[PDB]
């Protein structure tokens, strides 16, 4: 609670993930226009353009509430302040400001991550399965985004541990690894499921997103989510958090009793495996049958692993 040295390495680790994530996106997008792949390049740059814009809009609202140049005064201006004090922390109630301001930045990175880690991983992995082998540049973004997803998720768990003392049993290295592999495996199963459908009909998957997106948006209304003050920001916050629910569940408002997660996943298990039954019972000549078996194997085994990890975490801590 005093912003020890140990979590300082956790904070500084962000940039060597963040700036590498940022430089990977810009170096990769121009490469697509350099090789002629205009569609992927412009669309992968759309995420980073929208990714930094969404957090900046939240950044301005948070900065204005706590308080042309201000337009570009976003995450970089916020991030420099904490390390300016953080460097003094290594040098030697500033502790209250340091911990509260850092954990505020951490959450904004999560929405910056899961709006750039998960949805952007789709395009690259969709452009890797299609072309077979891919190259080094695409492997860079996939690994760093996986690192970004891994780093942000565990960082959120640390924030949950320190924000409130209710989860005192969360202490230990085992909860860190179990919940981390919960995202990395459950997402991978659902991502690989969306990718497989994406080859069949692009339009159906995109329209399927709207139905799932609006359900998450409506789900914000029923829970009466409230974290921003501006009425326009309130509309935006339910939009962005609703989009995340399509990829994974996050227990909005932290006041539930495991009931909504069971409903969200009891349809996930039937939805994901139900898709596999469609392909197995109704074979498709479009997809090569040689490599379709390991993909069909890894989509179900990873999902089986994901629900298994859930029992360990909730069944012994929650």
């Amino acid at each position, epitope marked *: 609670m005093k912003y020890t040295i140990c979590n300082f390495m956790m904070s500084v680790l962000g940039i060597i993930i963040y700036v590498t994530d940022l430089v990977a996106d810009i170096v990769l997008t121009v490469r697509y226009f350099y090789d002629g792949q205009y569609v992927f390049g412009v669309l992968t740059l759309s995420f980073v353009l929208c990714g930094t814009l969404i957090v900046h809009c939240f950044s301005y609202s948070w900065l204005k509430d706590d308080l042309l140049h201000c337009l570009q005064g976003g995450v970089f201006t916020r991030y420099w302040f904490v390390l300016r004090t953080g460097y003094h922390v290594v040098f030697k109630d500033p502790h209250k400001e340091a911990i509260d301001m850092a954990t505020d930045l951490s959450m904004l990175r999560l929405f910056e991550t899961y709006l750039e880690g998960c949805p952007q991983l789709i395009l690259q992995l969709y452009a890797f399965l299609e072309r*077979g082998q891919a190259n080094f540049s695409q492997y860079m973004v996939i690994m760093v985004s996986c690192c970004a997803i891994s780093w942000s998720t565990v960082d959120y768990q640390i924030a949950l541990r320190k924000s409130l003392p209710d989860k005192n049993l969360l202490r230990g290295f085992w909860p860190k690894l179990t919940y981390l592999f919960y995202k990395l495996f459950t997402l991978l199963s659902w991502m690989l499921s969306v990718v497989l459908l994406l080859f069949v009909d692009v339009r159906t998957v995109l329209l399927l997103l709207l139905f799932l997106w609006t359900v998450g948006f409506i789900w914000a209304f029923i829970n009466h989510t409230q974290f921003c003050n501006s009425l326009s920001m309130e509309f935006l916050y339910r939009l962005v958090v609703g989009f995340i629910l399509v990829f994974t569940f996050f227990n909005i408002k932290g006041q539930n009793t495991k009931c909504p997660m069971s409903c969200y996943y009891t349809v996930r298990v039937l939805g994901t495996l139900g898709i596999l039954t469609v392909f197995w019972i109704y074979p498709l000549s479009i997809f090569n049958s040689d490599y379709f078996i390991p993909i069909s194997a890894t989509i179900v085994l990873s999902l089986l692993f994901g629900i298994i990890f859930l029992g360990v975490y909730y069944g012994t801590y929650h």
Partner: nanobody
Amino acid sequence: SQVQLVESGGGSVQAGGSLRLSCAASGNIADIYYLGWFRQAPGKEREGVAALITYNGRTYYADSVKGRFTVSLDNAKNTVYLQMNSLKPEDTALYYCAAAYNGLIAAPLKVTRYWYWGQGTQVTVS
């Protein structure tokens, strides 16, 4: 690139005649599953015309050119050959040959499927 594809045999030939093309893959082609050909002329995008599977040899074709193209592979020279008979005026286009590593999608006619390409040769029909 690990390998370089070389295109040759292009030239000028009268309508209804015959002409042969060769595409040579210099290097390691052990992991190459699909390789084929394309047609490209100004005013239109690339579309697949012919392709084959290195493992078996089943020559997938296009309905527009089905029953006409003659695509054969010779592993002795590590190359592929293409044969024309009774040309049509719209055949005038750039012919490129390209390969692709084995993946998941099985449709070697899509332009975005193949990984790396070659320079190509100009061919015209009179």
